Coordinates of C-alpha atoms in Angstrom, one line a residue:
Chain A
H1 CA 103.4 104.5 102.7
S2 CA 101.6 101.4 101.4
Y3 CA 99.4 102.1 98.3
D4 CA 95.7 102.0 98.9
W5 CA 93.2 100.7 96.3
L6 CA 90.4 103.0 97.6
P7 CA 90.5 105.7 94.9
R8 CA 90.7 102.9 92.3
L9 CA 87.9 100.8 93.9
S10 CA 85.5 103.7 93.7
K11 CA 85.9 104.0 90.0
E12 CA 83.6 102.0 87.7
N13 CA 85.0 99.5 85.2
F14 CA 87.8 98.6 87.6
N15 CA 88.5 94.9 86.8
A16 CA 89.9 93.0 89.7
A17 CA 90.9 89.3 90.1
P18 CA 88.6 87.3 92.3
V19 CA 90.0 85.4 95.3
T20 CA 89.1 82.1 93.7
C21 CA 91.7 82.6 91.0
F22 CA 94.4 82.2 93.6
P23 CA 94.8 78.6 95.0
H24 CA 97.4 79.7 97.6
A25 CA 95.3 82.6 98.9
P26 CA 93.6 82.3 102.3
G27 CA 89.8 81.8 102.3
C28 CA 90.0 80.6 98.6
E29 CA 88.1 77.4 99.3
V30 CA 85.3 79.1 101.2
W31 CA 85.0 81.9 98.7
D32 CA 82.3 79.9 96.9
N33 CA 80.2 80.0 100.0
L34 CA 80.2 83.8 99.6
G35 CA 78.1 85.5 97.0
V36 CA 77.2 89.1 96.1
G37 CA 74.2 90.5 97.9
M38 CA 74.4 88.6 101.2
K39 CA 73.2 90.1 104.5
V40 CA 76.0 90.5 107.1
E41 CA 76.4 92.0 110.6
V42 CA 79.0 94.7 110.4
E43 CA 80.6 97.3 112.8
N44 CA 78.5 100.4 113.1
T45 CA 80.5 103.5 112.3
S46 CA 77.7 98.0 118.2
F47 CA 76.9 96.1 115.0
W48 CA 74.3 96.6 112.3
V49 CA 73.1 94.6 109.2
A50 CA 74.5 95.5 105.8
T51 CA 74.5 94.1 102.2
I52 CA 77.5 93.2 100.1
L53 CA 77.1 95.2 96.9
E54 CA 80.4 94.5 95.1
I55 CA 83.3 92.0 95.7
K56 CA 86.7 92.9 94.2
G57 CA 89.3 90.5 95.6
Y58 CA 89.1 90.9 99.4
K59 CA 87.6 94.4 99.1
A60 CA 83.8 94.5 99.5
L61 CA 81.5 97.4 98.8
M62 CA 78.9 97.4 101.6
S63 CA 75.6 99.3 102.3
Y64 CA 73.6 99.5 105.5
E65 CA 70.0 98.3 105.7
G66 CA 67.9 101.4 105.8
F67 CA 70.1 103.4 103.4
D68 CA 68.8 103.2 99.8
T69 CA 71.0 106.0 98.4
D70 CA 74.4 104.9 97.1
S71 CA 76.0 107.8 98.8
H72 CA 76.4 106.3 102.3
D73 CA 78.0 103.1 101.0
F74 CA 81.5 102.1 102.2
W75 CA 84.3 99.8 101.2
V76 CA 85.6 97.3 103.7
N77 CA 88.2 94.5 103.8
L78 CA 86.1 91.3 104.3
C79 CA 88.6 89.3 106.3
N80 CA 89.9 92.1 108.5
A81 CA 86.9 94.2 109.6
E82 CA 84.4 93.1 112.2
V83 CA 82.1 91.4 109.7
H84 CA 80.0 88.4 110.8
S85 CA 77.1 86.4 109.5
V86 CA 73.6 87.3 110.7
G87 CA 72.6 86.0 114.1
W88 CA 76.1 86.3 115.5
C89 CA 75.5 89.3 117.7
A90 CA 72.6 87.4 119.4
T91 CA 74.9 84.6 120.5
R92 CA 77.4 87.1 121.8
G93 CA 74.6 88.8 123.7
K94 CA 75.0 92.0 121.6
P95 CA 72.0 94.0 120.3
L96 CA 71.7 95.2 116.7
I97 CA 71.7 99.0 116.8
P98 CA 70.6 101.1 113.8
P99 CA 72.7 104.0 112.5
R100 CA 72.1 107.5 113.8
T101 CA 70.8 108.7 110.5
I102 CA 68.0 106.1 110.2
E103 CA 67.3 105.4 113.8
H104 CA 63.9 107.2 113.5
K105 CA 63.2 106.2 109.8
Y106 CA 61.2 103.0 110.4
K107 CA 58.4 102.4 113.0
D108 CA 58.7 98.6 113.7
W109 CA 62.3 97.5 113.4
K110 CA 61.1 93.9 113.9
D111 CA 59.1 93.7 110.7
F112 CA 61.7 95.7 108.9
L113 CA 64.6 93.4 109.7
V114 CA 62.4 90.4 109.3
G115 CA 61.3 91.6 105.9
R116 CA 64.9 92.2 104.9
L117 CA 66.1 88.9 106.2
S118 CA 63.2 86.6 105.3
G119 CA 64.6 84.4 102.6
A120 CA 67.9 86.4 102.4
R121 CA 71.3 84.9 101.8
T122 CA 74.1 85.1 104.4
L123 CA 77.5 83.6 105.4
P124 CA 77.9 80.2 107.0
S125 CA 78.2 80.3 110.8
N126 CA 81.7 78.8 110.5
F127 CA 83.1 81.2 107.8
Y128 CA 85.6 83.4 109.5
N129 CA 86.8 80.5 111.7
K130 CA 87.8 79.0 108.4
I131 CA 89.5 82.2 107.4
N132 CA 91.9 82.5 110.3
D133 CA 92.7 78.8 109.9
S134 CA 93.6 79.5 106.3
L135 CA 95.8 82.3 107.4
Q136 CA 98.3 80.1 109.2
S137 CA 101.5 78.8 107.5
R138 CA 102.6 75.2 107.5
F139 CA 106.1 76.4 108.5
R140 CA 107.1 77.9 111.8
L141 CA 110.1 80.0 113.0
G142 CA 113.4 78.1 113.4
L143 CA 112.7 75.5 110.8
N144 CA 115.6 74.3 108.6
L145 CA 115.2 73.7 104.9
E146 CA 117.3 73.3 101.7
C147 CA 116.6 76.2 99.3
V148 CA 118.1 77.6 96.1
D149 CA 121.2 79.7 96.6
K150 CA 120.5 83.1 95.1
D151 CA 124.3 83.7 94.7
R152 CA 124.7 80.3 93.1
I153 CA 121.4 78.8 91.6
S154 CA 123.1 75.5 90.7
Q155 CA 123.1 74.5 94.4
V156 CA 120.8 74.7 97.4
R157 CA 121.9 76.1 100.7
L158 CA 120.7 75.2 104.2
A159 CA 118.6 78.0 105.6
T160 CA 116.3 78.9 108.5
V161 CA 112.8 80.4 108.7
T162 CA 113.4 83.6 110.7
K163 CA 110.3 85.5 109.8
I164 CA 106.8 84.7 108.5
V165 CA 104.4 87.2 106.9
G166 CA 101.2 85.4 106.1
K167 CA 102.5 82.5 104.2
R168 CA 105.7 84.2 102.8
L169 CA 108.8 83.0 104.6
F170 CA 112.0 84.8 105.2
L171 CA 114.8 82.2 104.9
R172 CA 118.2 83.2 106.3
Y173 CA 121.1 81.2 105.0
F174 CA 123.2 79.2 107.5
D175 CA 126.6 80.7 106.9
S176 CA 125.3 84.2 106.4
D177 CA 123.0 87.0 107.5
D178 CA 121.9 87.4 103.9
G179 CA 118.7 85.7 102.8
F180 CA 115.5 86.0 100.7
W181 CA 111.7 86.0 101.0
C182 CA 109.7 83.1 99.7
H183 CA 106.2 81.8 99.7
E184 CA 105.7 78.4 101.4
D185 CA 104.3 76.8 98.2
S186 CA 107.2 77.9 95.9
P187 CA 109.4 75.2 94.3
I188 CA 112.7 76.7 95.2
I189 CA 112.5 75.5 98.8
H190 CA 112.9 71.8 99.7
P191 CA 112.7 69.5 102.8
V192 CA 115.8 68.3 104.7
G193 CA 117.4 65.6 102.6
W194 CA 116.1 66.7 99.3
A195 CA 119.3 67.4 97.4
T196 CA 120.7 64.1 98.8
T197 CA 118.1 61.8 97.2
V198 CA 117.4 63.9 94.1
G199 CA 121.1 64.4 93.3
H200 CA 121.2 68.2 93.5
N201 CA 124.2 70.2 94.6
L202 CA 124.1 71.0 98.3
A203 CA 125.8 73.6 100.5
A204 CA 125.4 73.0 104.2
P205 CA 127.4 72.5 107.5
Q206 CA 129.9 69.7 107.6
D207 CA 127.7 67.9 110.2
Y208 CA 124.6 68.2 107.9
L209 CA 126.6 66.8 105.0
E210 CA 127.7 63.8 107.0
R211 CA 124.2 63.4 108.3
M212 CA 122.8 63.2 104.7
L213 CA 125.5 60.8 103.7
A214 CA 125.2 58.5 106.8
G215 CA 121.5 58.2 106.2
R216 CA 120.3 55.0 104.6
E217 CA 116.8 55.0 103.1
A218 CA 113.9 55.8 105.4
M219 CA 116.1 56.1 108.5
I220 CA 118.2 59.2 108.3
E221 CA 119.1 61.4 111.3
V222 CA 116.4 64.1 111.7
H223 CA 116.5 67.0 114.2
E224 CA 113.7 68.9 116.0
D225 CA 113.9 72.0 113.8
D226 CA 114.1 70.1 110.5
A227 CA 111.4 70.8 107.9
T228 CA 110.5 67.5 106.4
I229 CA 108.6 66.5 103.2
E230 CA 105.2 66.8 104.8
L231 CA 105.3 70.6 104.6
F232 CA 106.2 71.0 100.9
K233 CA 103.7 71.4 98.1
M234 CA 104.7 69.4 95.0
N235 CA 103.3 69.4 91.5
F236 CA 103.6 65.6 91.4
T237 CA 103.8 62.4 93.5
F238 CA 106.5 59.8 93.9
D239 CA 104.0 57.2 92.8
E240 CA 104.6 58.4 89.2
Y241 CA 108.2 57.4 89.5
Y242 CA 109.9 54.1 90.4
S243 CA 111.7 53.2 93.6
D244 CA 115.1 54.4 92.5
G245 CA 113.5 57.5 91.0
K246 CA 115.5 57.1 87.8
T247 CA 113.6 59.0 85.1
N248 CA 113.8 58.1 81.4
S249 CA 111.8 61.0 79.9
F250 CA 114.1 63.9 79.2
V251 CA 117.7 63.2 78.2
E252 CA 120.9 65.2 78.5
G253 CA 121.4 67.6 75.6
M254 CA 117.7 68.1 74.8
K255 CA 116.6 71.6 73.9
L256 CA 113.5 73.4 75.0
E257 CA 112.2 76.8 76.1
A258 CA 112.0 78.0 79.7
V259 CA 111.3 81.1 81.8
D260 CA 114.6 82.7 82.8
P261 CA 114.8 82.2 86.6
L262 CA 117.0 85.3 86.9
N263 CA 115.0 87.5 84.5
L264 CA 111.3 86.6 84.7
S265 CA 110.6 88.9 81.8
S266 CA 112.1 86.4 79.3
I267 CA 111.4 83.0 77.9
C268 CA 114.6 81.6 76.3
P269 CA 115.8 78.4 74.7
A270 CA 117.3 76.1 77.3
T271 CA 119.4 73.0 77.4
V272 CA 119.0 69.9 79.5
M273 CA 122.4 69.8 81.2
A274 CA 122.0 67.2 84.0
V275 CA 119.1 64.8 84.5
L276 CA 118.6 64.1 88.2
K277 CA 116.2 61.7 89.9
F278 CA 112.4 61.8 90.3
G279 CA 112.0 64.0 87.2
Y280 CA 114.2 66.8 88.5
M281 CA 116.7 68.2 86.0
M282 CA 119.3 70.9 85.8
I283 CA 118.9 73.1 82.8
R284 CA 120.8 76.2 81.5
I285 CA 119.3 79.3 79.9
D286 CA 121.1 79.6 76.5
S287 CA 121.1 83.5 76.6
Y288 CA 123.3 83.2 79.7
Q289 CA 126.8 84.5 79.3
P290 CA 129.4 81.6 79.2
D291 CA 130.3 79.9 82.4
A292 CA 132.5 76.8 82.9
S293 CA 131.7 76.3 86.6
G294 CA 128.1 75.2 85.8
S295 CA 126.9 77.6 88.5
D296 CA 124.4 79.2 86.1
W297 CA 122.6 75.9 85.8
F298 CA 119.1 75.9 87.3
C299 CA 116.8 73.1 88.5
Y300 CA 113.4 72.8 86.9
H301 CA 111.1 69.8 87.4
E302 CA 109.8 68.0 84.3
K303 CA 106.2 68.8 85.4
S304 CA 106.9 72.5 85.7
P305 CA 104.6 75.0 84.1
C306 CA 107.6 77.2 83.5
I307 CA 109.2 74.9 80.8
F308 CA 107.8 74.7 77.3
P309 CA 108.5 72.7 74.1
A310 CA 110.4 74.6 71.4
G311 CA 108.5 77.0 69.2
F312 CA 106.1 77.7 72.1
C313 CA 106.8 81.4 71.8
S314 CA 106.4 81.5 68.0
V315 CA 103.1 79.7 68.1
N316 CA 101.6 81.8 70.9
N317 CA 103.3 85.0 69.7
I318 CA 105.8 85.6 72.5
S319 CA 109.0 87.7 72.2
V320 CA 111.6 84.9 72.7
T321 CA 115.0 85.9 74.0
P322 CA 117.6 84.5 71.6
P323 CA 120.6 82.5 72.8
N324 CA 124.1 84.1 73.2
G325 CA 125.5 85.2 69.9
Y326 CA 122.1 85.4 68.2
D327 CA 120.0 88.5 67.3
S328 CA 116.3 88.9 67.6
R329 CA 115.2 89.0 63.9
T330 CA 117.8 86.5 62.8
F331 CA 116.7 83.5 64.9
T332 CA 114.8 80.3 64.1
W333 CA 114.8 76.9 65.8
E334 CA 115.5 75.1 62.6
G335 CA 118.5 77.2 62.0
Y336 CA 119.5 76.8 65.6
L337 CA 119.2 73.1 65.6
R338 CA 121.3 73.1 62.4
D339 CA 124.2 74.9 64.2
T340 CA 124.4 72.9 67.4
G341 CA 123.2 69.6 65.9
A342 CA 121.0 68.9 68.9
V343 CA 117.5 67.4 69.0
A344 CA 114.7 69.4 70.4
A345 CA 112.7 67.9 73.4
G346 CA 109.7 65.9 72.4
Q347 CA 106.3 67.4 72.5
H348 CA 105.1 64.4 74.5
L349 CA 107.7 65.1 77.3
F350 CA 105.7 68.2 78.2
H351 CA 102.3 67.8 79.9
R352 CA 100.5 71.2 80.0
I353 CA 96.9 71.3 81.2
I354 CA 95.0 74.6 81.2
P355 CA 92.8 74.9 84.3
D356 CA 89.7 77.1 84.6
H357 CA 91.9 79.7 86.4
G358 CA 89.5 82.5 85.4
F359 CA 92.3 85.0 84.9
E360 CA 91.4 87.7 82.3
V361 CA 93.5 90.5 80.7
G362 CA 93.1 93.7 82.7
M363 CA 92.3 92.1 86.1
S364 CA 94.2 94.0 88.8
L365 CA 96.1 92.0 91.4
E366 CA 99.0 92.2 93.8
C367 CA 102.3 90.6 92.6
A368 CA 105.6 90.0 94.2
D369 CA 108.9 91.0 92.4
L370 CA 110.8 87.7 92.0
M371 CA 114.2 89.5 91.9
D372 CA 113.3 91.4 95.1
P373 CA 110.8 89.2 96.9
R374 CA 110.6 91.7 99.8
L375 CA 108.2 93.7 97.6
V376 CA 104.7 92.9 96.6
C377 CA 103.6 95.5 94.0
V378 CA 100.4 96.7 92.3
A379 CA 100.0 94.7 89.1
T380 CA 97.8 93.8 86.2
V381 CA 97.3 90.8 83.9
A382 CA 98.7 91.8 80.5
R383 CA 98.4 88.5 78.6
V384 CA 96.8 85.0 79.2
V385 CA 98.6 82.4 77.2
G386 CA 96.7 79.2 78.1
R387 CA 97.7 78.8 81.7
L388 CA 100.7 81.0 81.5
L389 CA 100.3 84.7 82.6
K390 CA 102.2 87.8 81.8
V391 CA 102.0 90.1 84.8
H392 CA 102.7 93.8 84.4
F393 CA 103.5 96.3 87.1
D394 CA 101.3 99.4 87.1
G395 CA 103.4 102.5 86.1
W396 CA 106.5 100.8 84.8
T397 CA 108.1 99.6 81.6
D398 CA 107.2 96.4 79.8
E399 CA 110.6 94.9 80.5
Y400 CA 110.0 94.9 84.2
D401 CA 107.1 92.5 83.6
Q402 CA 107.2 88.8 84.5
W403 CA 105.9 85.5 83.0
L404 CA 104.2 83.8 85.9
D405 CA 102.0 80.6 86.0
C406 CA 98.3 81.0 86.9
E407 CA 98.9 79.0 90.0
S408 CA 102.1 80.8 91.0
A409 CA 102.4 81.5 94.8
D410 CA 103.7 85.0 94.0
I411 CA 100.4 86.4 92.8
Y412 CA 97.8 87.6 95.4
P413 CA 94.2 88.9 95.3
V414 CA 93.6 92.6 95.7
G415 CA 93.8 93.6 99.4
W416 CA 96.0 90.7 100.4
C417 CA 98.7 93.0 101.6
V418 CA 96.2 94.6 103.9
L419 CA 95.1 91.2 105.1
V420 CA 98.5 89.8 106.0
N421 CA 99.9 93.2 107.0
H422 CA 102.4 93.4 104.1
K423 CA 103.6 96.6 102.5
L424 CA 102.1 97.1 99.0
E425 CA 104.4 98.9 96.5
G426 CA 102.4 101.2 94.2
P427 CA 103.2 103.1 91.0
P428 CA 106.1 105.6 91.0
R429 CA 105.6 109.3 91.9
Chain B
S1 CA 77.9 68.6 96.6
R2 CA 77.4 72.2 97.8
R3 CA 73.8 73.1 98.6
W4 CA 71.7 75.7 100.4
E5 CA 70.5 75.1 104.0
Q6 CA 68.0 76.9 106.2
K7 CA 69.6 78.7 109.1
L8 CA 67.5 80.0 112.0
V9 CA 69.2 83.2 113.2
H10 CA 68.4 85.3 116.3
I11 CA 68.4 89.1 116.5
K12 CA 68.6 91.1 119.8
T13 CA 67.2 94.6 120.2
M14 CA 65.8 96.7 123.0
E15 CA 64.1 95.2 124.7
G16 CA 63.1 91.9 123.0
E17 CA 64.3 89.0 120.9
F18 CA 63.1 87.4 117.7
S19 CA 64.1 84.9 115.0
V20 CA 64.4 84.8 111.2
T21 CA 65.2 82.0 108.8
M22 CA 68.0 82.7 106.2
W23 CA 70.1 80.8 103.7
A24 CA 73.8 79.7 103.9
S25 CA 76.0 77.8 101.5
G26 CA 77.4 74.5 102.6

């Protein structure tokens, strides 16, 4: 049973994140052409005109025209239900039929509707045509892409898109039936030939390996089911780097803070282990238990919102997870740079810009568990540190939380699961 | 720039038809 927001929508003072807060959400760009109190043609519970009283995410509180008591109002899902802009039924040759309760209430329906609609606001004619178009994913079934090995995050494995829910892809690895769910805009998936040019560890078939090696510049062997660079959302452009892609910003051995990719509830000191090309770099979480295989190393890009300069947690009052061998109370950066004798990463190397993301503490939303991406659960914004968010799951401990960026592809507006037919995990029983 | 525009809409009922002018964001 998927959790329903209905008993929580009805309550007053229920703060919910607006769709516009989510760049990756469908209908996000046309949500500004939609305002509170617009007249719409809606299914008559045959269509009838109604008014949008409240808008909480995708959920919309609607009231018929002819009902002036807030006791016959009803909640709908805007992008699912048979809602259209006014004048649509006319083109479809369908007559607007008044509800049974008010069918005798007014004398001249002409001057009533005319009065209600004269100078009234409504949706653009091409509104829901832009919704369904925004529902589609850039990826299709059968596409092959390099993505981070969840059993060895130091390398990327060749995988295949075997299931698409909205814009969340299920990637099945090549040598296995094991796999993981992932949003198309997430930075853990990469086009064919990404690890080859970047310099990232790659696990793939022997033929694929030879194929990447045999390739010389812009002419590499590409197959019909290969996902190429045109389908992958980046936080940067190759214009910002030279031809060879050799970066000179970060250097090996630099120390910084970073979100633990394996435990999203923790920001920890991290070490620049290997500097790859085009700003990509392999870092290691310092709290990680020792490993000499380097298989615990993880790839963050230098323009990632999930890496921070040292002291970022102290300044913004965040409980920083100490490195291995250090205790909570007894940890300072000055004392830690004294021990290792390593320079902290420059403040200039980090470029953090806080957008008008409009996220406020208390705003309810639907969030996906990173450590079990099959689940998208009921959540709530706990903290707003600049552009960094701290998302909490309703009905769980504060250690199950996760530090997500405001523009993460793992957060969704309320009613998203109902829109894309995904199962929404609610609070425990 | 996003601005308001006048949209002539039609409404069908038994047994006639009429038109009203509304606003839409574009």
